[PDB]
Amino acid sequence: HVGSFYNDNATAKRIVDVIPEEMVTAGFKMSGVKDEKEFKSLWDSYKLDSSLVDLLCWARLYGGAAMVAIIKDNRMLTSQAKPGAKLEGVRVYDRFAITVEKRVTNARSPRYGEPEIYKVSPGDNMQPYLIHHSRVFIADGERVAQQARKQNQGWGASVLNKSLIDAICDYDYCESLATQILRRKQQAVWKVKGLAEMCDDDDAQYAARLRLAQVDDNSGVGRAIGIDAETEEYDVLNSDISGVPEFLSSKMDRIVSLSGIHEIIIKNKNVGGVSASQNTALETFYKLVDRKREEDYRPLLEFLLPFIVDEEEWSIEFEPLSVPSKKEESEITKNNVESVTKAITEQIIDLEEARDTLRSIAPEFKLKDGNNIN
Template sequence: MTQPLRLDGYESALIGPRRFDLAYAVQDAGLLYARGGLYARVIDMPADKAVARGVEVEGDDGRLKDELDRLKVLPTLADGLRWARLTGGAGIVIVADDGRVNQPLNPGKIHQIAELRVFDLNDISADERRYGDPTKANYGMPEFYRVHSGGAIFTVHESRLIEISGDPLPAKVRTRGIPWEGRSVAAQAFPAVTRYLEALRLSVNILQRKQQAIYGMKGLAEMIQGGLEPVVQKRISLVDKVRGVLNTVAIDSEDEYRIEDTNISGVKDVIQEEQVGLSAEVGIPVTILFGRSPGGLNATGDADFDGYHEMVEGLQRTRATPALERIVSLIYAQGSFSSPPDSWTIQWPPLRVPTEKERADVRKTNADAEAQEMNALETAAGLGVVSEEEAREYLEAQERYGLKPKAGPDGSADYANQT
């Protein structure tokens, strides 16, 4: 008969059925993102912020907004930025009525765009067919892409796919054969998130073990050698059960029982340093990522927001704007869109709107500066440094107080030269 595996005597006696749970982190970025929390937050925040305040198209007469809403352009663009950060790239497939998706897009035959579908880089692979004319700018570029949608695979002509690349990646390390493949933010960010969460878990364990009970049992070694591990386990379990603030622990007179208090003064510093490390990996300030108040004397957090907004504006300029320009141009090319504007420009609204107090402070600062300037001008006129006429001409040139520059006898150019 097979004998059951017998563990080391001390392990059997002191631990018994109690075992330490080992946590194994999931390495797949998509599965980690699906868990939500910080894994999703570091990916979603910049993408959502980039389109949070909408977009303005100068030159539009108001009809474009309806088309942007119908095609869900901004949510699609946010998803494209999101998946590009997660996987290193994304593609928006244009579904229109000018032909099949595996045929070249013909803007002149589009009556209406049906929808826009976004796919991450893991769902896109380059076809073997490439452009072969060395005199063209697309020489060597993929002519077709294979797109995985659920359980189906379909081929898309490159003219119907609007690419959104991830972070810059050297050409020699691109392994998919896709020229716009980029670097995934998750590659470095997710391990940093895992380290931070592990630090939190260990800190909770430290709190649980802040007061460590030590039970000095007489004859422990002899009992283990005699095969009395169950007796040892039972005695330890009884002490653990009755231990508490209002309970009394009863032990043998020759046994020893004491509580050791663990110092946890450095745990907070470790957690904060892990937050700083995570912030550095993802490019999102700690004050924004964790919702913490700025630390230090006279700290306002303005520098944190300025840096974060610069990063988001970079996403808008380099990733979102090229994709949006292509989409807007195709919307205007639709046969159902009559009389499109001759010229138009995409403008992103400011990411941060000043509060009423901030606007009032700016007005007050400007008013104080103007008052000081007027006092200086009045003093200069009183001392004869400038004449009243020269002072008035200066105010007219600055268009202060509703004054406008007067055109000289030889035109505005001569007047500007005189002043």
């Protein structure tokens, strides 16, 4: 069961939860709507951030998840949701809590074989309640071969496959072995002529062990032991610890290679390379996050938006993860403003187009609505 491994291990938890939070925190930007501040207020009214993050995390962990949208359509759950309603809230679920009841049986239809009505078992104390497929969004995990997908009742695979679990367990075992190797570096062996002639439970053994304990407690550098010759000796056996840290670093490097995430994120320790600018070492992680958002986050937004946004025409543009410093921002604004001003001269751009370009390219300027100036 992956739940216990996710709970106990911190590395697995970071691997599972590092991507969805990074994707969701950046946010999204929509163009084509008339009122932008009103839309922002409407979106922040629903406060669906935690539900989205939990849905993505469960989809990555278990291999599947789903979200049920509660709507004010004034009809049955089985009945289709007509356009026009404005949503009341969402309910995230787990992979094992949803099963299909009926599916399409029309061969000529392009949507043939896909589910039509889901049971949606809520667990806890409630009873299952069927829902039309137009009100349920199915999020799939990692891609799996179709033959194994059929055995997985049409659900994807999990991020924590066999290789990652084996690597993490191997690293933990190697760390334990390293501690044990450090523990036994010197051993002092004490030999006596007659020592097997004891009852093994009488006062003689007790006294001998107490004496040995006190002697090894009080000895060291600057203190000596008096040994009786011709009946007793004292020897010390040494060892070494040569290349343990490099071994552990190599095993952690294997974990980093298998996980699919940059070493800076997993090891959470810079200085591994020379001091670069900043984002240069994180460009690979940023590319991975952009690919992941384009693959997973966009369908969820395109499913949720038609039930919130009134306008029929809209599009989603994702904000960049990497933002420049304030000085670079000022230089960029100055360059854009000078370019627009040069465009204004020689009369090739007109005032209205230049004003729109200034409004869009440079959001720092607080332009007033309308191109009528004074």
